[PDB]
Amino acid sequence: GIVEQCCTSICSLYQLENYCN
Amino acid sequence: FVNQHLCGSHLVEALYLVCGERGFFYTKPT
Numbered sequence: 381g382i383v384e385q386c387c388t389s390i391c392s393l394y395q396l397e398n399y400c401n
Numbered sequence: 402f403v404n405q406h407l408c409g410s411h412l413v414e415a416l417y418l419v420c421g422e423r424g425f426f427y428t429k430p431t
Binding site for chain 2: 381383389393394397
């Protein structure tokens with residue numbers, strides 16, 4: 381959920397790499 | 402790189418930057 385996690389709050393690319401295919 | 406507030410482009414752009422060419426799926430609320 382980087383959407384509400386980065387849009388409602390913040391996230392780290394490390395957490396963004398978890399959304400990779 | 403560190404925590405960054407993202408939502409749409411800057412989220413897919415963020416994932417597209419973290420996943421690089423791998424890319425990502427990026428989920429969303431309906």
